[PDB]
């Protein structure tokens, strides 16, 4: 009993016994032992060893160092050794591994919690945590002695942690990369974006049904953002005649920057420069004529260089080089586009002629025209057809003998020939949605407040020009083919009566066009969505869940909500904003006495009810630090139930200070807050409750390293 030999025999046998605890269970029954029993046996080992070392040194002798070397060898192999080789520190590494393996299973459920409740911000957060453990920290798992044991840990706890993570590859890839391309346009880096959208746009096909909805919006919203803030550019340049060239733009252009100073033209592959005389810009601002002093050369190519140009209310153009190739066309035939001309003081004869080459191609520009007419020509191209019945016009190309000959032309006053457009509008905006209410919603989805609801029409005449000065109601009129569904005034005014569809049409003399405008059912209360599946409060505490209302189309419906609990004694209840106004309230459940009851959310016709069970508060067994950036410190009993809160006594400090933080009381309920110009330490008195990591905005609460064998 007392003698060293007996103490060492037993110390030896005991350290081995700690290892057989797990290895004989796993081998013989295919089960893990109770981790409590392993910890019990591990601590009993570490003592038995340490007692023996003490007993051995106290006896001394030549037997001493043999004993001590053996004892240590067993201890270092079977129980514990800092930085172990494989086969060593068996029990220690199994503990580490079994604790590691249980965290995965847990996180894997927390992750499956988020995919179900469809919180994408949280599913991503836990995807990262899991993907780190699964990649970096499987080292812990490989230390374990016992391939049988090593597999059982992998099958029982890791296999399904993998599986679940691996099918969220795509959901996260997109959600990440979408956010990155959104962040590249806030900054000035369109190169990094696009490579991001290249990635987003090949993977949104393969997302799972979890967040399919939210990912698509975030993907389309990242495309849109990138378009709107894309650098304007010169599309192309093309010749017009021997002395002017056209230039087209991607965006509109600032008339103040479209000036001769900002264009440089050279004959390609030479020093020969051609200075521009003028720049005229289209009413739209997407093209411009640039005219030259010098004369272009049939066949040759010219390179234009743009710079210091600018968008309307916008940003600079990229200095760029574009070529164009002057080709003097060869006219063969010439023709009038109609047998008639409009009635007018100045009819511009060049607009009513068409020139072609011998192949049969219309030459849009390049040539000059001479005219003779029965009537007097002004600037050799304009005539007064006012009050005339007919006119003779002869059009010839200048150097050529290509002529129309003498052509008699009828003069015919403009008249509505065609309906160029007909749409429903309100306050200048085309409406895509309308309910029998009268409420109207535009292209995007937003409703148009104020402005009259009317039909709009434009017309072209028989020469294909838009008609102007024409008063709706006087010169043309509207009507509905179904007054039951939709009532229309002659001037365009509208007031719908009932859902369905109505055919509506416009009339300018004998010209008409008919359009359908569908009118839809009013928004009515279809769904009451609830944030919580079921509430677990504590006595003398409170809980929160949100209620959102939806209509039959799936849009935020505004309405009323009363809320009640079965039994007022086990749990009272209230609702935000007095129970009226919004499409989304927050319910507050107070606990008052242990047991159960249930909560009812009513709204007009339809109704949802939800379970409430209040637990009796245990004593304080822990303090959680939580991020909800705004910070809190909850007191928490043995079960994880929130009883008490101590955010007000606690003090934040820092270990180059990126962040400021201080207490922020609101109606008694205290909260900590983060600012800007590290890791923060949360203390209660001189005790440290934990640390926080902050980055640049985003804050995660540190987790304490609980590994026996550091890596």
TrEMBL record:
Keyword Metal-binding (UniProt): yes
Domain BIG2: 442-518, 524-613, 627-678
Chain sites annotated for binding Ca(2+) 3: 655, 657, 678
UniProt keyword list: Calcium, Metal-binding, Signal, Zinc
A single MF term (Gene Ontology): identical protein binding
Entry superkingdom: Bacteria
Name of the protein described by the UniProt record: Surface layer protein
Encoding gene (name): sbsC
Span of the entire protein shown here: 31 to 774 of 1099
């Amino acid at each position: 009993a007392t003698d060293v030999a007996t103490v060492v025999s037993q110390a030896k046998a005991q350290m081995k016994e700690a290892y057989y605890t797990y290895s004989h269970t796993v081998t013989e029954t295919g089960q893990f032992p109770d981790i409590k029993d392993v910890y019990a046996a591990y601590n009993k080992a570490k003592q038995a060893y340490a007692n023996a070392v003490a007993v051995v040194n106290k006896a001394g002798g030549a037997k001493k160092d043999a004993y001590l070397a053996d004892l240590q060898a067993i201890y270092e192999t079977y129980v514990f050794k800092a930085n172990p080789k494989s086969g060593e520190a068996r029990v220690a590494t199994y503990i580490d591994a079994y604790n590691y393996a249980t965290k995965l299973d847990k996180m894997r459920q927390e992750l499956k919690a988020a995919v179900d409740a469809k919180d994408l911000k949280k599913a991503e957060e836990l995807y990262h945590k899991i993907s780190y453990e699964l990649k970096t920290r499987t080292v812990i798992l490989d230390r374990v002695y016992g391939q049988s044991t090593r597999e059982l840990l992998r099958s029982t706890f890791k296999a399904d942690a993998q599986a679940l993570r691996d099918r969220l590859i795509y959901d996260i890839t997109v959600a990440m990369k979408a956010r990155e391309a959104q962040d590249a346009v806030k900054a000035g880096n369109l190169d990094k974006a696009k490579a991001a959208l290249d990635q987003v746009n090949q993977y949104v096909s393969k997302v799972t049904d979890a967040f399919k909805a939210e990912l698509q919006k975030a993907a389309q919203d990242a495309k849109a953002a990138y378009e709107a803030a894309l650098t304007p550019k010169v599309e192309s340049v093309s010749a017009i005649d021997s002395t002017s060239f056209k230039v087209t733009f991607t965006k509109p252009v600032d008339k103040a920057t479209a000036i001769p100073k900002n264009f440089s033209i050279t004959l390609k592959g030479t020093e020969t420069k051609l200075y521009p005389k003028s720049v005229e810009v289209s009413e739209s601002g997407l093209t411009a004529t640039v005219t030259l002093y010098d004369t272009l050369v049939d066949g040759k190519t010219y390179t234009v260089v743009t710079s210091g140009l600018k968008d309307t209310a916008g940003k600079e153009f990229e200095t760029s080089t574009n070529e164009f190739t002057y080709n003097k066309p060869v006219p063969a035939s010439i023709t009038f586009n109609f047998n008639k001309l409009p009635e007018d003081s100045a009819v511009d004869l060049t607009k009513y002629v068409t020139v072609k080459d011998a192949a049969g191609n219309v030459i849009k520009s390049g040539f000059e025209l001479e005219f003779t007419s029965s009537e007097k020509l002004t600037q050799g191209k304009f005539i007064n057809t006012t009050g005339k019945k007919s006119v003779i016009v002869n059009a010839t190309v200048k150097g050529t003998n290509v002529t129309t000959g003498n052509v008699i032309l009828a003069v015919e006053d403009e008249k509505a020939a065609e309906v160029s457009e007909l749409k429903l509008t309100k306050d200048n905006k085309e409406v895509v949605t309308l309910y029998a209410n009268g409420n109207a919603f535009d292209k995007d989805g937003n409703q148009i407040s104020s402005g009259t609801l009317t039909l709009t029409a434009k017309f072209k005449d028989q020469y294909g020009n838009e008609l102007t000065g024409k008063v709706a109601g006087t010169d043309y009129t509207f009507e509905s083919l179904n007054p039951e569904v939709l009532v229309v005034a002659p001037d365009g005014s509208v007031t719908p009566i009932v859902p369905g569809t109505a055919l509506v049409k416009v009339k300018y003399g004998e010209v008409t066009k008919t359009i359908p405008v569908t009118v839809k059912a009013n928004p009515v209360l279809e769904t009451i969505a609830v944030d919580s599946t079921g509430v677990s409060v504590a006595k003398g505490q409170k809980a929160t869940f949100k209620v959102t209302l939806k209509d039959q189309y799936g849009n935020k419906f505004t309405g009323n909500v009363n809320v009640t609990s079965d039994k007022t004694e086990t749990a009272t209840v209230s609702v935000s904003n007095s129970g009226i106004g919004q499409s989304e309230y927050t319910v507050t459940v107070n606990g008052v006495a242990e047991g159960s009851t249930t909560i009812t959310i009513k709204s007009g016709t339809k109704e949802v009810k939800v379970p409430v069970n209040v637990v009796a508060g245990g004593p304080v067994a822990n303090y959680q630090i939580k991020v909800l950036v705004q910070l809190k410190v909850y007191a928490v009993d043995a079960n994880g139930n929130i009883v008490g809160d101590i955010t007000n006594d606690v003090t934040i400090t820092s270990e180059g200070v990126i962040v400021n933080a201080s207490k922020s009381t609101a109606n008694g309920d205290t909260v900590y807050v983060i600012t800007d110009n590290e890791t923060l330490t949360v203390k209660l008195g001189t005790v440290t409750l934990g640390t926080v990591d902050v980055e640049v905005l985003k804050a995660t609460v540190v987790t304490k390293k609980a590994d026996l064998i550091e890596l």
